[PDB]
Amino acid sequence: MADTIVAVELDSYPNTDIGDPNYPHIGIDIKSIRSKSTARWNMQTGKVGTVHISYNSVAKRLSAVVSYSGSSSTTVSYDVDLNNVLPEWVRVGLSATTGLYKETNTILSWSFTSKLKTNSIADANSLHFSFNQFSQNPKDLILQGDAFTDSDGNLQLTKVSSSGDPQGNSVGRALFYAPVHIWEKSAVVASFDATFTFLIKSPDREPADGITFFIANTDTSIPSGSGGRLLGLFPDAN
Amino acid sequence: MADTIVAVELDSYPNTDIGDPNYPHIGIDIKSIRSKSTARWNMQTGKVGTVHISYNSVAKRLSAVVSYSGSSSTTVSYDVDLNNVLPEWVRVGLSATTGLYKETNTILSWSFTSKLKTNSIADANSLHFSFNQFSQNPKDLILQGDAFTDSDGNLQLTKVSSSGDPQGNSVGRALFYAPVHIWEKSAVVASFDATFTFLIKSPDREPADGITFFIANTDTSIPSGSGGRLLGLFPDAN
Amino acid sequence: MADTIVAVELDSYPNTDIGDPNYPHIGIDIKSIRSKSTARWNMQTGKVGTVHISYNSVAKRLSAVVSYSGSSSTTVSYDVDLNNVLPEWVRVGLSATTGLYKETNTILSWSFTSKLKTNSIADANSLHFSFNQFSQNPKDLILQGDAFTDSDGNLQLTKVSSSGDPQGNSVGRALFYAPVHIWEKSAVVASFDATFTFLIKSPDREPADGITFFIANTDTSIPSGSGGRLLGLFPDAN
Amino acid sequence: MADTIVAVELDSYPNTDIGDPNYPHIGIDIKSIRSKSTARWNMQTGKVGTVHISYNSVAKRLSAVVSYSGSSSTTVSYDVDLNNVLPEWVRVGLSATTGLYKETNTILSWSFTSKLKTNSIADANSLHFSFNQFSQNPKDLILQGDAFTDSDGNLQLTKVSSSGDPQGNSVGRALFYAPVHIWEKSAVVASFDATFTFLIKSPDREPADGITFFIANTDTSIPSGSGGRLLGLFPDAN
């Protein structure tokens, strides 16, 4: 049985044969690579970008924003009730790919908070983590595929040479080690927010393929055939 | 020279003559007592209730949920860009009233978090406070009208007798002492979250008038003529 | 090789044989059951207690306080550099035992925060979790020995019958699932704090054996021979 | 009539005639400019520094660490019960002065957390603010003397010219707007943590005079005659 995925994609490469708009874009992916909602993303290759993501079960609106120093931001939102989509326990992560074309998929920092409140006025259960650099052997991350942490304390989701040159046909992901509780039968409100900073560099005219923040079943793994345009998340483009 | 008001009301008394639905309701108030959105509130007089309020500038949805132990919740939301409504600096507060009819408007706890993030590398600016108990002399609150802290460590927004019985024609508010920064020219995303627990008791078969969490110009004060149905927030019913 | 243990013990049963003082006590344990520091704990069996523990690497003072509603608190401290003791990556946990004599070792809530500041700017890393009730399937806990979560949402560290009657000769522990990063080469300051609430009930005249909060090597497991007076932490009394 | 002051000073200029050690030093000040504890400061004029300060009422140890890019660290600690020094309600702030000699007293960020926990089931009361830039009109700061926010979003505690050259005989302070509750009779534990980053530059061979983080009576003001060596904090050198 396939994983169940919700993701925010920073999609650098337009794959118009599988429903991408014809420009780099941000998107909200609900169980499919074909985003439920997109916005045109004005990439700044070579510059550090920031992504902020948030949701809560009352508003039922998942939103993301991407910005760079000085520049205008790109936003995207989608109305969705995540408890109709995801299981009650999840893992959260980051993924990235390259394909025929390539780019660095470098993460410089990543934080995440979730809260789960029940009517029983026990206060909310909560989880927060923050990484402002990464350990070169990160015991609180599950690294999958080609993901690794370099000597600069950067998380490299996809392969780069010793010179820092990105490689094609690469896929990797990093999940936080602890499962996250995002609903239960008695729950009143669940919320989460996530931030990460990133550095996509590329020598290619058309960099590819992009980076995501994603939420999945706890035992999620890189699907077979999920390289390139599928962002290490899906086994097909349905 | 009137205040600028955004509020979530727990309106226990139907004033159908000024547009209330004909039942106790939770509502979102944008510069008018006449709610832009309401939902039926199934009151549990004598039982401790919990309200959670959330907003962010990307999703632009103001949401609130009210619940009691072992009971279903009631939610209300309204799509609104708060930057088009409120000033950049605000104060946040709780208000309550009684009129001809009455209830205790007792607050057992109140917390609030705000974050403001700009395009810069700088992490979000933030404020958080949490009161799970109120001090006899709460120097971090601006107490307005009949509002006072009692011997049990509770905030009473409106008058109660020496034996704990509510009095009619009362108005009271409590503002957090520090102004909150909610937008800036340079801003990328702003968000706030708030929670309070409340205890409404009444000897009246129909209690009145309600409690709000509100946001306003920093110099906000109880308007003249704001008693009873106007919840201590508005000078008229327009 | 043997685990590395730093613990705060709530030691309900005096084993004067192995150096316990002749009264219930709160103790700080560094690599030995024989506490580096103790203070008398005036137990209130059948009443909900609270423990707060804190440390930072500049002050180098590990402190704990135990209290009950309307009671005098008891404090214990020890001056130690915890990096002389602990590995850079640890798991944090709660343990309990019963032996010949018994008690319930019930956990009603548990929170923990750690922060590590280096050379990057704001926290190289932070981790916080808060459990105000425990799920029936707590996927973010590693439960060892007899530890289980019950129908009331409490964490029971040691065995209880269907009636809630504690059992003798029981051992149980619960670890937070994710490893915690408490030091690295570039580190300037590291800190943590933890809080738990507990309900110890017993039909025995002298309840036994107690509860700890502990920090260990990530791969920590209940040592052979760690029953009773050794609190599920140590293979012997050295 | 005189303020009540607790401070951590970064004293760039040795005033031996008022009991400074004869080198730049960090110190802990309890109701006097004459530090109760000092450490030689591994000082790096022209480089951005970071300060971390912490205290809790159980350990009763006020500790500070100053470092630069995670290196050149200086630490100072002092054993003191702040309950016996400070009032229950305070304001927290930053101060800085120049005198005959001069330096920029630039603050690039400032954060603060306080927690106060009593016997009750009630969880901690708390306050947190984080400023990673300073806005043009900081309505949540009480700016005293020469302190202002500049075009870069930095807080300048003392006078700098239009070109960025520091001026002599300056004094400035910034207080967080909300009073902070650091103790109550029913308290079990109270704690606070403060961080700030700073940038001290000087065309002088000897910069002066220094920067402090301080905790005072809520109504604290710059004492008359508190320039230069007295750091904007004390009326005299007693």
Ligand SMILES: OC[C@H]1O[C@H](Oc2c[nH]c3ccc(Br)c(Cl)c23)[C@@H](O)[C@@H](O)[C@@H]1O
């Ligand atoms: O990295 C960009 C893309 O490269 C590959 O698709 C192609 C894009 N342009 C091409 C041109 C020729 C050939 Br053959 C291929 Cl496979 C492609 C595939 O790996 C895609 O999944 C990926 O999105």
Ligand SMILES: OC[C@H]1O[C@H](Oc2c[nH]c3ccc(Br)c(Cl)c23)[C@@H](O)[C@@H](O)[C@@H]1O
């Ligand atoms: O507390 C409930 C209500 O009591 C008063 O309104 C009346 C309720 N019943 C009435 C009957 C007659 C007249 Br006149 C009035 Cl104003 C009222 C007014 O104080 C209202 O503002 C308030 O909402």
Ligand SMILES: OC[C@H]1O[C@H](Oc2c[nH]c3ccc(Br)c(Cl)c23)[C@@H](O)[C@@H](O)[C@@H]1O
């Ligand atoms: O639970 C209380 C204690 O019970 C046992 O030790 C004894 C305490 N009193 C005794 C009396 C007789 C014998 Br045999 C034993 Cl083992 C004990 C052992 O299980 C101890 O580890 C434990 O601390």
Ligand SMILES: OC[C@H]1O[C@H](Oc2c[nH]c3ccc(Br)c(Cl)c23)[C@@H](O)[C@@H](O)[C@@H]1O
């Ligand atoms: O900025 C450094 C110092 O400059 C002044 O003190 C003097 C330093 N050298 C002097 C020489 C003569 C005289 Br009079 C004075 Cl006050 C001083 C005073 O402003 C001091 O408070 C300050 O610490």
Ligand SMILES: [Ca+2]
């Ligand atoms: Ca694509």
Ligand SMILES: [Ca+2]
């Ligand atoms: Ca009404």
Ligand SMILES: [Ca+2]
């Ligand atoms: Ca013992």
Ligand SMILES: [Ca+2]
């Ligand atoms: Ca000096």
Ligand SMILES: [Mn+2]
């Ligand atoms: Mn796409």
Ligand SMILES: [Mn+2]
């Ligand atoms: Mn947000």
Ligand SMILES: [Mn+2]
């Ligand atoms: Mn209404």
Ligand SMILES: [Mn+2]
């Ligand atoms: Mn919330």
Ligand SMILES: [Mn+2]
């Ligand atoms: Mn012991």
Ligand SMILES: [Mn+2]
């Ligand atoms: Mn603490």
Ligand SMILES: [Mn+2]
């Ligand atoms: Mn000095």
Ligand SMILES: [Mn+2]
């Ligand atoms: Mn700290």
